[PDB]
Design a protein around this nucleic acid. Structure first.
Ligand SMILES: [Mg+2]
Ligand SMILES: [Mg+2]
Lengths: 106, 288, 288, 105, 287, 286
DNA sequence: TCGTAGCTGAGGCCTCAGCTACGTTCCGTTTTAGAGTCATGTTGTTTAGAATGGTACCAAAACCTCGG
DNA sequence: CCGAGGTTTTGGTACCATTCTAAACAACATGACTCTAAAACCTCGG
DNA sequence: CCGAG
DNA sequence: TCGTAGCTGAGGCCTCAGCTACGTT
């Protein structure tokens, strides 16, 4: 409908004790914001409208860990749905769907 | 805001972790971000859940519904403190004048009757539809003449036949009742969010039940449920139930925009409250 | 319907078996027949509970209360088909007369000032103690002269020196605040149990304070905290914290008997409410 | 107008055959002119949709049949909106859509 | 392939994994070979490997060499532009003198028309019509030298009657440079069809080895003329950079906006088919 | 202009200094004055070279030749402003008369047949050797009778048995083919050096080196010898034994010469005869 | 001072199970500025996907030339 | 005059790289609401 | 005035 | 039978320098 996906990818350093801590904090942030792990170091977040997207971008700058390479890509649900699984199983978690109605059980 | 209706009917453990609802069944496991959830509906009696989860559900303003051994709803969580400054609105609500309540209540019921008529028109009962509009024109403050009740009896007989009363035990009433409870819960939630007490209705104010004010506000919306069950009149109750969830999926025209029902209910409620508070004139209008 | 108020504040699992509420903690178990229960109060966020239990609790119209991470109440279950008798209290509370509120409030604050004085006496400040009693004798309804405030300022300066204000980021204030919040929560919880809204104070009428009425009721008890913090005024905050839990462990004289604090607060609150409701005369008295 | 093909993988490493399978696939990616954006994450510029269908075909032919491997097609315009929350933008020629290039200047 | 890679820094070029590898002391770039259309080596401070050159020749990449003043001086000439190369040779040797005349003259006509169109473009309505007249009087192999008269007029009109086209100046330098770029494009395309470039339509083997390319590029000369004219007051180094627009821009050809190298491919293939008497109409390019 | 043909086939770095070509290998170093050089031939893919060098090579109009990973030529530098004299050869080659091509081709094939016979003799087949000489005597221009082909079939059957054809997939043919390719490349390279195109041959299949195949014909038995002597061996051994072609010396024009040197002289002269600048095809025999 | 293909071991990225330690810090009230929310509509631009036109290449129809 | 066979022009399918075009979209516009902190006000005994 | 309510 | 915050060490992903062997020399 109006939904979009925010795709976030990172490579973050681990040499130092502080940059490990910096990572753990950032990942925690991502999980708490409702990002879901697509692959290691690569996370996606479903968003309802652009209004919500601008807001999340804002929150991301606020919790910038200021280390490594961290990169964001916006795309429509429609575009994301065209993702091609060359191999491996599709992600059928509820969190990864657009569905307004969900049944757990049934 | 939040937009998912989560229905739980499997033996399971609900818990909270990292801003997610955590669903664990023996086979399967799901995490759902709390900000995504609009409604949590607990259909069965085989579910465990934690008080942390409940707290967090109440924080986010999530409608939580409890059910029977027959999967009918039986109660709601009622937050005590729906907003940062709830004391302020409460004082205003206590000061609502009896005249202003009458104006607003009667305005609202008029909208219900109009929507009942529009629904009749929709089903090619051009005639009885006009009849209801007539009953509406005869309405006086607090409807001392059941015009509301006269209108409703007519409305229902014309839809489901003159053999039908709204007190008789059948699939149609069960469906109507269920749908009406969903609506009740939506407006109960919205009222508490604006800082009002739901116990204090405009006409009867707490005499009978604890959600009178919600019942008052939901009135114009009843036909939405009526439509859905009319269209599935011949179906089984379990199907009626599932079709009723369309209320949360669909969009409806309200104030020139097509909006989701929970969002309409928010705006509608806020404005009704503003008018009761005498901060503005003119009750908002919802028509089907 | 029943008579027991069941308070749960231990990490535990609640479930239903054989018309009993089943309480399981790691330490021990309890079974409690449902017909014996009037109120179920869930103080903490470390509790699991089943939907079966909730259904059955709603059947019986047992008042179920939820609390947050600070043990303040945040909501209750709202049945769609009946009412715990606590629902009747709201009407009564709305009817509290301005005079009766004044009487009760002023009575209460008098008790606070007395207890502040007694505490000063206790610390061999014979002289400033008498000074407070003087301020008390001059008290009029709703304290327009602010005798309370002048008493307090004096009280605190005497105890912690003239250089001391309640707003400076001390270990002492931190300790006081913490202790006061414990007390607040005790009385917030007791008030909602009786069916009152805590948002509606007698004199506390702050738009942001969701617990004005609780703040009013806890007033005479503040010195209990003051005593403890004073005795540990030279200690670190973590120790102050730990020493404050004595409030729950110790016993205090109340109506000729040595009672635990939570029990006192229950009796105290119930009676204050009865006298506001004009069902009895004579505010209950608590002195240190 | 140009497209980008974004390819992401997580591939197993436990066994010797898994590892070999990986090395082969990565080699193919490099040889096809994919660029490492991040570890396990590669992008390829393509001209037309003809080229894209053709690459997709070559990818199925060299599918290593292990792990999770996903592809995303997007317009150059979409890719150019990529936000670097931190770290420096990639100014390698291979990553640009410029017809005229200068190694120097 | 679609990129023009320009190298003018002290560097080492090499080949690895289907990439051109550029290594300078500062930084390092890899460029996929299939992406490259033209490799231009501007300076004399560059090392390169024979492996790289082989692979450049495999992919059909135009490689240009420059002197100390960054002017081009030569190109790589592949020997075997196809696997089927023998077939075209035999055909090319059989090109009849009359058909060569027809094709050559057709082509020169297109050049003159484009010279005219360019004059028209600069509001010389009058001299433009004059060229069209010279065109109408063309006969096979242009014995009258209408081409040369048309050109002298064209250039005097554009750059004044003081201007020769043999004088040492920025304008001619620019023209010459641009013309060489074009030459190289068509030299490549010819070899790719299996033709020898030494064998021109009017003069075969006469004073140079790319006569046939010069013949084919004729209609395209005004493209360079336009650019230089528009920058006639600029310095040579700017003229040079502006000329790379030829590879960036698109031009109308057979009803479509196409890139110049692609046009040159289609144009060349069809000219060759007509010379082979496999088809009739010479293809037309107009500016 | 100059007179030297500089051949580079070792991993090396070419550069320019003080009007010299500078050759640096890990072993050897050489400076060569640019005015001395006629042709620069880059046989292998393991060579670095600078653009300065290239500029200066182009200034002098030195013919620069490039080769692939097999050492076949694949291109040359084309100057925009002049011409190596090699450019004149193309015109001459186009003018080769059909008669002259016939004479030269037939002369050449005769040499091949002779050498096939000499090889048979070498293996104590005195009789079949004479038979080939007979086929040779019956040769006419462009061999319409296919005496070449009959000779070859006989030759090969005698060497490898009557069950053997040259089209069968086996180690012997693989070895032959490989060896023949080496030879092909040597002559391909020499032809392009003289300014000829290798694509169209003297007789007759679209191969890009027909003319090279024609020239190499008399040399084929050199390979045949080696493969015959290792006919029982594995292909990888056959391959390594074949490199003897580059290491050994052979009698040619009264002296023991290396094969590549022979091929140069041989080719240059064959071309001169085709151009009708000389009479008498050069002769190579085992 | 060339390439390819393949494997190995060193060392950096990334997640996760598992451990320890911690767990109520206001209450005179109302005003105001500011940062953080939000779901809808409006507008020209971009895009995916199929049409086009100019090809090749190959069965068809139509065209032809005798023989009954 | 028929059609057998064969020789020719014709029109068909199958292919690309552009171009077109209905549909999807980004980015801004709108018109609000929520919570927080700090700062403003209250009385009046040191 | 401060600063307690 | 509840949560958080913080760190660690085990173990799997991912790349790369460095090694061997080969190549119509
Ligand atoms: Mg990564
Ligand atoms: Mg990965």
């Amino acid at each position: 409908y109006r939904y979009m996906r925010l795709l976030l990818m990172f490579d973050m350093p681990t040499d130092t004790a502080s940059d490990r801590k910096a990572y753990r904090k950032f990942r925690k942030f991502l999980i708490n914001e409702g990002f879901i792990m697509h692959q290691f170091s690569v996370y996606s977040k479903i968003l309802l409208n652009d209004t919500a997207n601008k807001a999340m971008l804002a929150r991301l700058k606020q919790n910038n860990p200021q280390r490594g390479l961290i990169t964001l890509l916006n795309v429509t649900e429609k575009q994301f749905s065209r993702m091609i699984y060359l191999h491996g199983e599709q992600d059928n978690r509820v969190a990864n769907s657009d569905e307004r109605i969900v049944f757990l059980g049934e | 805001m939040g937009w998912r209706t989560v229905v739980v009917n499997k033996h399971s453990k609900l818990s909270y972790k990292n801003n997610h609802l955590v669903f664990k069944a023996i086979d399967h496991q799901e995490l759902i971000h709390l900000s995504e959830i609009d409604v949590l509906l607990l259909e069965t009696t085989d579910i465990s859940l934690t008080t942390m989860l409940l707290k967090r559900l109440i924080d986010e303003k999530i409608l939580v519904l409890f059910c029977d051994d027959k999967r009918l709803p039986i109660g709601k969580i009622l937050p005590f403190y729906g907003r940062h400054d709830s004391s302020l609105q409460l004082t205003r609500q206590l000061a609502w004048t009896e005249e202003r309540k009458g104006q607003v209540w009667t305005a609202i019921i008029a909208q219900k009757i109009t929507n009942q008529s529009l629904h009749l028109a929709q089903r090619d009962y051009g005639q009885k539809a006009a009849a209801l509009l007539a009953m509406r024109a005869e309405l006086r403050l607090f409807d001392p003449a059941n015009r509301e009740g006269h209108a409703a009896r007519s409305y229902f007989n014309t839809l489901f036949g003159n053999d039908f009363t709204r007190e008789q035990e059948n699939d149609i009433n069960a469906g109507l009742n269920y749908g009406y409870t969903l609506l009740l819960s939506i407006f109960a939630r919205e009222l508490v969010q604006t800082g009002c007490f739901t116990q204090l209705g405009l006409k009867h104010a707490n005499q009978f039940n604890d959600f009178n004010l919600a019942s008052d506000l939901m009135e114009p919306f009843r036909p939405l449920v009526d439509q859905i069950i009319y269209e599935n009149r011949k179906e089984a109750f379990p199907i009626m139930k599932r079709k009723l969830f369309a209320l949360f999926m669909n969009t409806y025209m309200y104030k020139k925009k097509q909006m989701f029902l929970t969002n309409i209910a928010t705006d509608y409620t806020k404005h009704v409250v503003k008018v009761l508070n005498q901060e503005e004139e003119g009750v908002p209008e919802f028509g089907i």
